[PDB]
Amino acid sequence: RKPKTGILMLNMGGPETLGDVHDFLLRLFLDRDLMTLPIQNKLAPAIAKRRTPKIQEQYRRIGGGSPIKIWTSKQGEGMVKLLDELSPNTAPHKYYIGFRYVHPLTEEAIEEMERDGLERAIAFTQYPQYSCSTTGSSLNAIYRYYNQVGRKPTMKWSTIDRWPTHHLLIQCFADHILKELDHFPLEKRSEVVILFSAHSLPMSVVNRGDPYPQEVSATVQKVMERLEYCNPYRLVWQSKVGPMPWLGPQTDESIKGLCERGRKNILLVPIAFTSDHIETLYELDIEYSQVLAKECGVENIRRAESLNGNPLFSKALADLVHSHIQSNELCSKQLTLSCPLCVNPVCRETKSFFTSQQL
Amino acid sequence: RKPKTGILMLNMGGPETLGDVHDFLLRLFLDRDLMTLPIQNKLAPAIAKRRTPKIQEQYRRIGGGSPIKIWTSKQGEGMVKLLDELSPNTAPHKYYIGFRYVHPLTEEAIEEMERDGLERAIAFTQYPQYSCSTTGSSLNAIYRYYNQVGRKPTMKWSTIDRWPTHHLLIQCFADHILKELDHFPLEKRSEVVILFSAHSLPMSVVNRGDPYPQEVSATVQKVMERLEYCNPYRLVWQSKVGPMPWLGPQTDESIKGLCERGRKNILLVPIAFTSDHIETLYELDIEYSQVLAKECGVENIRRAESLNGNPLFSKALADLVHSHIQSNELCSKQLTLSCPLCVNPVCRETKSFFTSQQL
Ligand code: HEM
Ligand code: HEM
Ligand SMILES: C[C@H](CCC(=O)O)[C@H]1CC[C@H]2[C@@H]3[C@H](O)C[C@@H]4C[C@H](O)CC[C@]4(C)[C@H]3C[C@H](O)[C@]12C
Ligand SMILES: C[C@H](CCC(=O)O)[C@H]1CC[C@H]2[C@@H]3[C@H](O)C[C@@H]4C[C@H](O)CC[C@]4(C)[C@H]3C[C@H](O)[C@]12C
Ligand SMILES: C[C@H](CCC(=O)O)[C@H]1CC[C@H]2[C@@H]3[C@H](O)C[C@@H]4C[C@H](O)CC[C@]4(C)[C@H]3C[C@H](O)[C@]12C
Ligand SMILES: C[C@H](CCC(=O)O)[C@H]1CC[C@H]2[C@@H]3[C@H](O)C[C@@H]4C[C@H](O)CC[C@]4(C)[C@H]3C[C@H](O)[C@]12C
Ligand code: FES
Ligand code: FES
Secondary structure: OOOOOOEEEEOOOOOOOOOOOHHHHHHHHHHOOOOOOOOOOHHHHHHHHHHHHHHHHHOOOOOOOOHHHHHHHHHHHHHHHHHHOOHHHHHHHHEEEEEEEOOOOHHHHHHHHHHHHOOOEEEEEOOOOOOOOHHHHHHHHHHHHHHHHOOOOOOEEEEOOOOOOOOOHHHHHHHHHHHHHHHOOOHHHHHHHHHHEEEEOOHHHHHOOOOHHHHHHHHHHHHHHOOOOOEEEEEEEEEOOOOOOOOOOEHHHHHHHHOOOOOOOEEEEOOOOOOOOOOEEEEEEOOHHHHHHHHHHEEEEEOOOOOOOOOHHHHHHHHHHHHHHHHHHOHHHHHOOOOOOOOOOOHHHHHHHHHOOOO | OOOOOOEEEOOOOOOOOOOHHHHHHHHHHHHOOOOOOOOOOHHHHHHHHHHHHHHHHHHHHHHOOHHHHHHHHHHHHHHHHHHHHHOOOOOOOOEEEEOOOOEEEEHHHHHHHOOOOOOOOEEEEOOOOOOOHHHHHHHHHHHHHHHHOOOOOOOOOEOOOOOOOHHHHHHHHHHHHHHHHHHHHHHHHHHOOEEEEEEOEHHHHHOOOHHHHHHHHHHHHHHHOOOOOOOEEEEEEEOOOOOOOOOOOOOHHHHHHHHOOOOOOOEEEEOOOOOOOOOOOHHHHHHHHHHHHHHHHEEEEEEEOOOOHHHHHHHHHHHHHHHHHOOOOOHHHHHOOOOOOOHHHHHHHHHHHHHHHOO
């Protein structure tokens, strides 16, 4: 009987096939909510065509592309089935995928949401921890959309802008870690170092007051608390790109460092991006890993699987949307506060957009 | 009857009067566990001699010195009181103050503990969040003492090396925040920005894998959690000393940035050091205060009071020692893992010292 409440699942998206790498990078380097460059409209196209090969090669190393679209759709379907039974008064619920750099683009999703004449629209970020470069950018695109077209929303908007410590999210992480620990030799289970690895941020972003580092750190603590501190751990940062300073310890140097110090069993945990993505140097480069073994004698380096399709995850997503609906919140209290050194005038416009929504 | 169980309260200490500033700084710049300098025994004395004036001036700005000794004794007394009732089997309990850079020095306390013929010693750090530069140095001192004294412990040791999320520590923080929120105008109370301010670390220490940032971030989340996210917040880092890069955002830069962006009511929270200490630029310099208020219109900048003498705090300390005793742990799981890029050979020796303890 026609969709009443829409759930816009926000994420950066990812190249479906190596053939999509170029336009993925193009939009990424063009995103001013993510980064600002001189003559950006001219430089973005250049940087894209340039790194495309290097990035296609990395995706080939992981299967030939990103499975984010499929995974997100599967979780989206599962979330809906639960919501339709959990919240009959807001049903039927329908999910929309809003990727930032690839189709379905955020704008394309909003446009479709408007045409379906939904009553309520929920901007639901798929990043548990908040960064102005990920969730912030996705939220800004929504504000940018209506402002671009030059007209007001025909729907009631609200947002779930962060959920770093949602109990079911923490349970899923704990479950996957225990599962992977089972794959290490029984005699070494106790010695396994749990290395939580999240994507790093440039120090310039960290220093302007980005919320991300603190929230990822919160997720980590909740997870270890659930696991009753069964193993030692560290929160490290990966995939750092460029010569500029990024928040460390770097994941690669940390793995090597740990091996040089006798820790031969390591469990990497994707603590800040719920879908499979590009792995680290010691996981992909046979040369680097072999040397590490010859010199330090590394025994086991495993990675916990992504929350990809765990049914308990869809339940996590449905639980979040449900609670949100019951609370009547328009956004978290944290969104009402911009970075201390924020220099993007769109940010607060986006904030007002959500806090000023009807209902 | 004689002291059965001894509780060694570890901290860096602080100059009791302006006259004690020099040797405080001398012992600090000489600390290898906190700082590694070339020909350190040569440069330390010089640095101390040169910084004394500036540091004496800072302490004068806050009353003439540090109240850490008095406060730690009072808390220690209260802790012992509660312990003799809570843990009859390990009673009588006696607390010893072990400061790193001032009397009573860590070594003096150990030496006295030995003479008291205790049946069990507990190295209890007063820093709830672990850093190799704070708790690590104090623990390494215990190992360095027995090692340099060329003798073995006559007591069975164990350590409470961290407690970033202890439920009563969190309750004390929330109580002090609510209490301070009451000092702002009722109409503006919901507009107050809670700025958790912790002492920063050099980026070189952060990148080596220091545990501190993630643990401080955990304390913050637990506190806001208890406060049910009543106000927006940010975790910033203060007193970064020197020209080298330290973890930001800086407290001074954030306060200014915030004011320039409309946030006129700010509540500073001493989230990582439980005793009064040097305040920030906008709390001391009258000139910066004026400039800021003139071109930003700051309305209220308040600092929550240090957990200094809150009885619930003494209760927190006793609750910790009690659980620690019943758990029979020798140290936390986290202490068994060194920084992935640790280059201090003593660290690993200190670890073995505690994990190898009898019982
Ligand atoms: C302002 C901070 C950030 C900047 C400047 C940034 C930049 C970039 C760039 C340039 C790429 C393209 C890859 C390349 O060309 O080498 C990329 C990819 C990516 N970024 Fe970020 N990023 C930031 C923060 C984040 C955060 C917080 C996350 C976490 C969820 C993240 C997740 C990703 C993912 C998942 C990819 C796809 C690559 C992969 O699978 O590893 N990024 N980022
Ligand atoms: C490894 C990194 C650190 C370095 C290099 C460092 C260095 C210093 C120095 C040189 C001083 C003397 C004052 C000055 O010359 O400016 C000082 C004082 C002090 N430090 Fe640190 N420190 C570090 C980490 C920390 C941490 C993590 C804490 C947190 C508990 C801390 C708490 C203090 C306190 C409470 C004082 C007394 C002065 C004040 O109130 O600011 N320091 N530190
Ligand atoms: C000058 C600008 C930084 C401006 C600023 O910080 O205020 C920096 C950041 C991005 C840099 C560009 C990107 O790194 C992409 C290219 C990298 C090449 O090695 C040089 C040209 C190249 C096009 C760089 C030119 C210049 O160093 C840029 C444009
Ligand atoms: C890694 C990439 C260059 C890739 C390449 O040359 O092949 C460079 C070029 C543009 C750079 C970004 C832009 O200079 C804009 C930002 C500048 C800040 O000082 C750091 C973050 C910041 C977001 C930079 C991160 C990183 O250094 C980037 C993304
Ligand atoms: C060279 C050494 C760093 C060595 C290293 O990183 O391997 C650095 C760190 C501490 C520095 C010293 C400290 O900053 C104290 C002094 C600061 C003055 O501005 C220069 C001399 C001065 C004495 C510095 C000399 C030199 O730059 C030092 C000694
Ligand atoms: C803060 C102080 C300068 C104070 C002043 O000029 O008033 C400077 C001079 C010596 C510096 C220290 C020395 O350079 C030795 C270390 C160098 C590392 O890169 C950072 C930590 C490190 C321990 C430095 C901390 C801080 O930058 C110090 C202590
Ligand atoms: S960059 Fe964080 S609020 Fe604008
Ligand atoms: S410096 Fe952290 S364990 Fe040695």
